[PDB]
Amino acid sequence: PDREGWLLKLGGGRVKTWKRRWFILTDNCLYYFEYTTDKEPRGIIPLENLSIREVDDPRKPNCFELYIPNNKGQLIKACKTEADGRVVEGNHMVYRISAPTQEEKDEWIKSIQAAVSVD
Numbered sequence: 001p002d003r004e005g006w007l008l009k010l011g012g013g014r015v016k017t018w019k020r021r022w023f024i025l026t027d028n029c030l031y032y033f034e035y036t037t038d039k040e041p042r043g044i045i046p047l048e049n050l051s052i053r054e055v056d057d058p059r060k061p062n063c064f065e066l067y068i069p070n071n072k073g074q075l076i077k078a079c080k081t082e083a084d085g086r087v088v089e090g091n092h093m094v095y096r097i098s099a100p101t102q103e104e105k106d107e108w109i110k111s112i113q114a115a116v117s118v119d
């Protein structure tokens, strides 16, 4: 992988809460898993056509967002796995993510910008 680590992700549904997932950036794609050894990703977020921005959040530190610029209301193309094994579409307009430190946030941002620009 180009980068891996624990990050908190905000949900995309009615009651949006933060969950800690193991994220792996590789192949112009951002994956996340429940455990570091899980063979299959719980979520797949292709980075094509996505941009990244810093954001401030009232509850969690060190945040950034993946989003579609000038978005006319479209969801980000992604997959997500439910409890029963079902592969479904992601429900997100944005992915808001929180890193443990400012240094980790900066390093994830540089890594993600390097992936999308050249692919």
Ligand SMILES: O=P(O)(O)O[C@@H]1[C@H](O)[C@H](O)[C@@H](OP(=O)(O)O)[C@H](OP(=O)(O)O)[C@H]1O
Binding pocket: 009, 010, 011, 012, 013, 014, 015, 017, 019, 021, 042, 043, 080, 081, 090, 091
């Ligand atoms: O129980 P709810 O209220 O429907 O909330 C969902 C629940 O927290 C899932 O665990 C989470 O998926 P992951 O385990 O894959 O992180 C999902 O994130 P999502 O909106 O990004 O799919 C939430 O929407």
